[PDB]
Scaffold this active site. Structure first.
Site, PDB file in Angstrom:
ATOM      1  N   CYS B 112       0.840  -1.194   0.000  1.00 47.85           N
ATOM      2  CA  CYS B 112       0.000   0.000   0.000  1.00 47.85           C
ATOM      3  C   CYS B 112       0.877   1.247   0.000  1.00 47.85           C
ATOM      4  O   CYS B 112       1.505   1.575   1.014  1.00 47.85           O
ATOM      5  CB  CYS B 112      -0.944   0.018   1.203  1.00 47.85           C
ATOM      6  N   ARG B 115      -0.097   4.338   2.850  1.00 46.82           N
ATOM      7  CA  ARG B 115      -0.067   4.139   4.286  1.00 46.82           C
ATOM      8  C   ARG B 115       0.429   5.298   5.064  1.00 46.82           C
ATOM      9  O   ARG B 115       0.536   5.070   6.280  1.00 46.82           O
ATOM     10  CB  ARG B 115       0.800   2.943   4.632  1.00 46.82           C
ATOM     11  N   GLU B 289      -4.118   4.365 -10.971  1.00 47.26           N
ATOM     12  CA  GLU B 289      -4.980   3.198 -10.791  1.00 47.26           C
ATOM     13  C   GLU B 289      -6.072   3.152 -11.843  1.00 47.26           C
ATOM     14  O   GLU B 289      -6.377   2.091 -12.396  1.00 47.26           O
ATOM     15  CB  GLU B 289      -5.602   3.223  -9.403  1.00 47.26           C
TER      16      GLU B 289
END
Ligand code: HEM
Ligand code: HEM
Ligand SMILES: C[C@H](O)[C@H](O)[C@H]1CNc2nc(N)[nH]c(=O)c2N1
Ligand SMILES: C[C@H](O)[C@H](O)[C@H]1CNc2nc(N)[nH]c(=O)c2N1
Ligand SMILES: Cc1cc(N)nc(CCCN(C)C)c1
Ligand SMILES: Cc1cc(N)nc(CCCN(C)C)c1
Ligand SMILES: [Zn+2]
Lengths: 411, 414
Positions: B112, B115, B289
């Site tokens: 990730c 974070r 993404e």
């Protein structure tokens, strides 16, 4: 055991058996992975036999002569030499085979589909820097081939006691100099400032220019290294221009056409060849992305984006990304226009997937360093990004070694 | 016993000791590394010798986070959990322990990049849920809360934990909000090809497909191992950004749009040996993404070709880098669209910069930060982002998010 790897773009699955033949550390432990660590952590008589036997075993297996009369005599001959001389000498066939398979086994190399077409230049008879200079000059003339580049390696005398090493202090055969100015700024290639100082120190009179081909600094038999200027007619160079932007040539960039690693170590049968410069041809993103656009390098991104009237306030305008593509179009177009061999990242990865599938089929797998294989730009739109890869260390291998100026004791 | 990682852009070295408390295997060995494998490494209803030591670890870990490094409460909690496992065959988490566990699963998410926010996580205890209708209610509350009219907020909703394997709560959607993928008669695919199977399961369950290119899938919700039930999310709850381009005025005429709220709803949140099979967690997008992967992947929306056509690019050969060039413009369009609508989005430059700061922070206070370079490096322009040159150690810390089988492989249909 067997191991499976999967392409998630295509669902192809390959079955790695070859990893059962891996040896030295990956660095990773059962509980920690180090796949992104660049450098993770002389042989005695006893240590050398098993290595020598393993490589002779694998060579004679590759030529369908395992257990043969000539195999069993070779072993006994190598066993003899290590008792007599605490070391042994490779036949020529074993040297060619070793070199090709060290390339084949280079996890980080995306060009390995060419592995079997390596020109091996045996220079184990070399004794002096001047002689190294002659071998490398011939290496470069051959490899460059007026733009139609050809893969080649030149292998110099193997290690002995470690006190008589042959080294090419250059990290590549052709690189440009870097000069740090009194005001902080850097003329030329910031990556090579330290090495540029070493040469200057050794008597090199530098032209203090932006693309000064550096001199070969060559060490032979553990003696202090010596300077040689490559003959300028042998250094193929490509001025970089752009197919759409006429202003691009006004950046006045160029690059050398011949990429050639020289700081590495070639292990075969447990013999270490500390000077083994090898050359191939360029993937465009090595120059276009890393040589030109890394912040610790030539860093022309702001320059190129300035002339592209890009909004350089917000990063989210993606000026850096936009400017990076155009620079890589220009790099490719320039080599192609001057008929100097180059490969774009799309074609190179597409060819690496084919090579990898073929290598699983005939060899049982193909070690591969995804962190190094994926191009440094446009990663996910190339097929290697979606390709799982297993990383292990097969030998013969290319190995990193310490920089010679950290080891050498001057005389 | 003490490993270092180095950044090659900035020569900064960090010293990792947190990996000494890594729990289970990464899949790698001294002999072969699997750092690029996506998945390396119902009767798992533990005995007491199997479940208690895990529980004892997490409670020990929680009570040491909170300065009660051994205390009255911590000792009672151990004995409480002890008797609970003896009788109820498992044990229940206090509200505080649950919030700590969720925040720390995210903290330990090696893949990730986001974070740095791990501690600003809204936790929605939904452990009282019993039905798919209730699950639908709790999820509609998550979506609305987390969307927050474009000012996205991180959140996780935690449905009841696994008990015997056959009373699992599951969200069958991989994300709460996904576009449908339809198999065309000729052989092409309309919509999002990643979801053709899930779309057919929904249709096989009686969802009437509108058969457009961006149809929002219904929730397929499963409670207490029972059959799953279809619910249509209210559209006023699903925020969508139409994709336009700041310069190319022809771009909006592509008929493109995406959703604003990314929400992973198919992973398993493991705490102290307890397994939470239903735990949708949402944040906000990194533009890559949507625009690198969702839009340009070959087995996804695959719009590179069409965008390049309209850009008038040499599509004769790859070396023109017509893909790369259109890839840039699309991500520009996506960021430009989310920001023009005041929907939270982060570019890949900003996001990787932040995570470098995060990493430094974790090596200051915790002694490490597990990271997955293969997943942290964005899928475009990797080397021009600071993480590409950042060495990373990877290891598995608990609590954590784990993958789990797609429930339709493993579900006994009542
Ligand atoms: C023939 C065409 C070749 C192509 C297109 C190619 C491409 C590449 C690229 C892009 C890299 C990454 C290097 C970097 O990012 O700095 C690499 C690494 C490497 N290649 Fe190749 N290469 C070729 C030939 C060769 C040859 C002929 C050899 C040896 C005989 C070789 C051995 C290696 C090794 C050892 C590395 C690792 C570099 C390192 O770890 O520093 N390659 N290759
Ligand atoms: C808040 C903004 C966030 C950003 C910008 C962000 C960014 C990312 C990105 C880019 C990935 C890789 C996704 C892909 O390419 O498929 C990822 C993965 C992941 N994130 Fe985050 N994330 C955020 C929030 C969160 C939250 C709130 C959680 C947990 C509650 C979380 C846990 C994870 C996990 C477990 C993965 C691994 C996904 C997988 O393995 O398939 N992230 N994140
Ligand atoms: C094979 C490889 O592990 C796989 O394609 C990974 C690579 N890196 C990734 N990185 C992110 N962020 N998301 C992904 O899905 C992937 N896929
Ligand atoms: C930290 C990281 O390992 C480092 O930046 C690596 C990543 N991948 C790479 N990949 C290539 N081709 N070349 C590189 O120099 C690197 N550097
Ligand atoms: C033989 C060869 C070809 C190529 N294209 N690239 C290389 C590596 C370049 C040096 N990097 C390690 C810095 C080697
Ligand atoms: C919570 C979250 C935030 C974010 N920005 N991105 C993701 C990735 C989701 C899709 N992949 C796992 C397939 C999740
Ligand atoms: Zn590993």
């Amino acid at each position: 055991r067997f191991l499976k790897v999967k392409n998630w773009e295509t669902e192809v699955v390959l079955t790695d058996t070859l990893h059962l033949k891996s040896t030295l550390e990956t660095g990773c432990t059962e509980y920690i992975c180090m796949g992104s660590i660049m450098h993770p952590s002389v042989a005695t008589k006893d240590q050398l036999f098993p290595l020598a036997k393993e490589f002779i075993d694998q060579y004679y297996s590759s030529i369908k002569r395992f257990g043969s009369k000539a195999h069993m005599e070779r072993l006994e001959e190598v066993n003899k030499e290590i008792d007599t001389t605490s070391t042994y000498q490779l036949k020529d066939t074993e040297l060619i085979y070793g070199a090709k398979h060290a390339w084949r086994n280079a996890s980080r190399c995306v060009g390995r589909i060419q592995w079997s077409k390596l020109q091996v230049f045996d220079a184990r008879d070399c004794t002096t820097a001047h002689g190294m200079f002659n071998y490398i000059c011939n290496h470069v003339k051959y490899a460059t081939n007026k733009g139609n580049l050809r893969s080649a390696i030149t292998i110099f005398p193997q290690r002995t006691d470690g006190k008589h090493d042959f080294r090419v202090w250059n990290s590549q055969l052709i690189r440009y100099a870097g000069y740090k100015q009194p005001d902080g700024s850097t003329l030329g290639d910031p990556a090579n400032v330290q090495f540029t100082e070493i040469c200057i120190q050794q008597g090199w009179k530098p032209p203090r220019g932006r693309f000064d081909v550096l001199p070969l600094l060559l060490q032979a038999n553990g003696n202090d290294p010596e300077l040689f200027q490559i003959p300028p007619e042998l250094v193929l160079e490509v001025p970089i221009r752009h197919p759409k932007f006429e202003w691009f040539k006004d950046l006045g960039l160029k690059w050398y056409g011949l990429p050639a690693v020289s700081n590495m170590l070639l292990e075969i049968g447990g013999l270490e060849f500390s000077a083994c410069p090898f050359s191939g041809w360029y993937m465009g993103t090595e120059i276009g992305v890393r040589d030109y656009c890394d912040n610790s390098r030539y860093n022309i991104l702001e320059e190129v984006a300035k002339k592209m009237n890009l909004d350089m306030r917000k990063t989210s305008s993606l000026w850096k990304d936009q400017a990076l593509v155009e620079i890589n179009i220009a790099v490719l177009y320039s080599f192609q226009s001057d008929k100097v061999t180059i490969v774009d990242h799309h074609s190179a990865t597409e060819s690496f997937i084919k090579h990898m599938e073929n290598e699983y089929r005939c060899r049982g797998g193909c070690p591969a360093d995804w962190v190094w294989i994926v191009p440094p730009m446009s990663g996910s739109i190339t097929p290697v990004f979606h390709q799982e890869m297993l990383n292990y260390r097969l030998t013969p291998s290319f190995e990193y070694q310490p920089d010679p100026w950290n080891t050498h004791v001057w005389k």
